[PDB]
């Protein structure tokens, strides 16, 4: 008939399945040198550049 075995234990292995990712290329291409380190404690929260 029925056995109903409770000897076993439901273990969870210490492994993580792979996930998903995306690519970051827009940050690399856009200009970063002009704005690099131009906002500091003596400027506030805004900096400006002249126009031709």
């Amino acid at each position: 008939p029925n056995n109903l075995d409770s000897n076993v234990s439901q273990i969870v292995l210490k492994k993580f399945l792979p996930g998903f990712m995306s690519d970051l290329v827009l940050a690399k291409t856009v200009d970063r040198q002009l704005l690099a380190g131009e906002i500091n404690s003596s400027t506030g929260d805004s900096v400006s550049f002249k126009r031709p």
């Binding site: 906002i39 500091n40 404690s41 506030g44 929260d45």
Partner: protein, 53 residues
């Protein structure tokens, strides 16, 4: 302490009260204390606070 004297002819002071010893004290105690406190944000010191000292 302080004391007082007696002026008698023969020096016998029978039946007269003598000096009484009384002790007094002066008390000193502490009081409220002086507190100065300030506060500021994080970006406030990041982009707006210079020469803090």
């Amino acid at each position: 302490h302080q004391f007082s004297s007696l002026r008698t002819p023969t020096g016998d002071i029978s039946g007269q009260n003598k000096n009484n010893l009384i002790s007094g004290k002066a008390t000193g105690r502490v009081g409220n204390y002086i507190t100065v406190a300030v506060e500021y944000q994080q970006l406030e010191e990041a982009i707006k606070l210079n020469q803090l000292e």
